[PDB]
Amino acid sequence: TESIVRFPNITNLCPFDEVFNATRFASVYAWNRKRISNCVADYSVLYNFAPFFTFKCYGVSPTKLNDLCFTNVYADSFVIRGNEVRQIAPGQTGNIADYNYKLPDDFTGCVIAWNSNKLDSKVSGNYNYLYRLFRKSNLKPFERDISTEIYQAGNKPCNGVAGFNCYFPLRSYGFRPTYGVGHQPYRVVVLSFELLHAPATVCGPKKSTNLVKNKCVNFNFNGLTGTGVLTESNKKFLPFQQFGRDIADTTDAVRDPQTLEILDITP
Ligand SMILES: *[C@@H]1O[C@H](CO)[C@@H](O)[C@H](O)[C@H]1NC(C)=O
Ligand SMILES: *[C@@H]1O[C@H](CO)[C@@H](O)[C@H](O)[C@H]1NC(C)=O
């Protein structure tokens, strides 16, 4: 008869505006990995800061962010012109994944991109389009290189600034506000979430309800749905552990975000 929800007891607001609005985002070879934690994230009011997006949610559904808790949310905003907006996907690779921002083979999270045909085009370009071109090692997921190189591919090992046979990476784009359409820049803002892990920091809309510990409920502990009976526990949960699993995939024990009480779950 009850539908108690047990979202964590925080009331802070998330730094979304400090990331999406900005003035200058980043370069595509050196992105900023901003941490979002310990704040209520209302994902409904996002469509006003930068509309005409894609939202490309490889994982949690577009309308389901305001349903569950996230332990760590990381947003990486940079500029890639117009050709790798769909090549930022985990399957695709090339000169934008092996030598730039790389998404992992498995990945939960969504990306946001909108056009910059006049706002971030500038006269003769803003010249902050530094892409690593090529290097010796294909980049690991979520890895950047703050470095220059004199890449050669190997003949008469050279470290000089000369272009021929001592090729210099870190080129850039840049133009007058009009060009052949395809080069017009785009502001890509990714959103990488993570689940399980530590006690959750980012939750969303809070609808916390009191506890009844000897009857059946439709409980909701940090976004997970379950039907069963809650009760006190005599287990030996270590302070870092969060959930209590059994022989199968279900959870028979859980720790509430407040009052830190281990609670057994039985149907
Ligand atoms: C970005 O900040 C400016 C003030 O510097 C404000 O006028 C503008 O509305 C903001 N854009 C948003 C919140 O999308
Ligand atoms: C959140 O919940 C309790 C009761 O509403 C509140 O008094 C307290 O500030 C929070 N819990 C903890 C453990 O801080």
Residue numbers in the entry: 323 to 589
Tell me, in the authors' exact words, what the paper reports.
Owing to multiple mutations to the spike protein, including in the receptor-binding domain (RBD) and N-terminal domain, Omicron BA.1 infection can result in substantial NAb evasion. The Omicron variants that have emerged more recently contain similar RBD sequences to BA.2, with the addition of L452 and F486 substitutions—L452Q in BA.2.12.1, L452M in BA.2.13 and L452R/F486V in BA.4 and BA.5—and exhibit a transmission advantage over BA. We expressed and purified the prefusion-stabilized trimeric ectodomains of BA.1, BA.2, BA.3, BA.2.12.1, BA.2.13 and BA.4/BA.5 spike (S-trimer). We determined the cryo-electron microscopy (cryo-EM) structures of these S-trimers at overall resolutions of 3.1–3.5 Å.
However, a local conformational perturbation surrounding spike residues 444–448 disrupted the hydrophilic interaction between BA.3 spike (S446) with hACE2 Q42, presumably owing to the single mutation G446S rather than double mutations of G446S and G496S. Group D antibodies were most affected by the G446S mutation in BA.1, BA.1.1 and BA.3; these NAbs therefore show higher potency against BA.2.
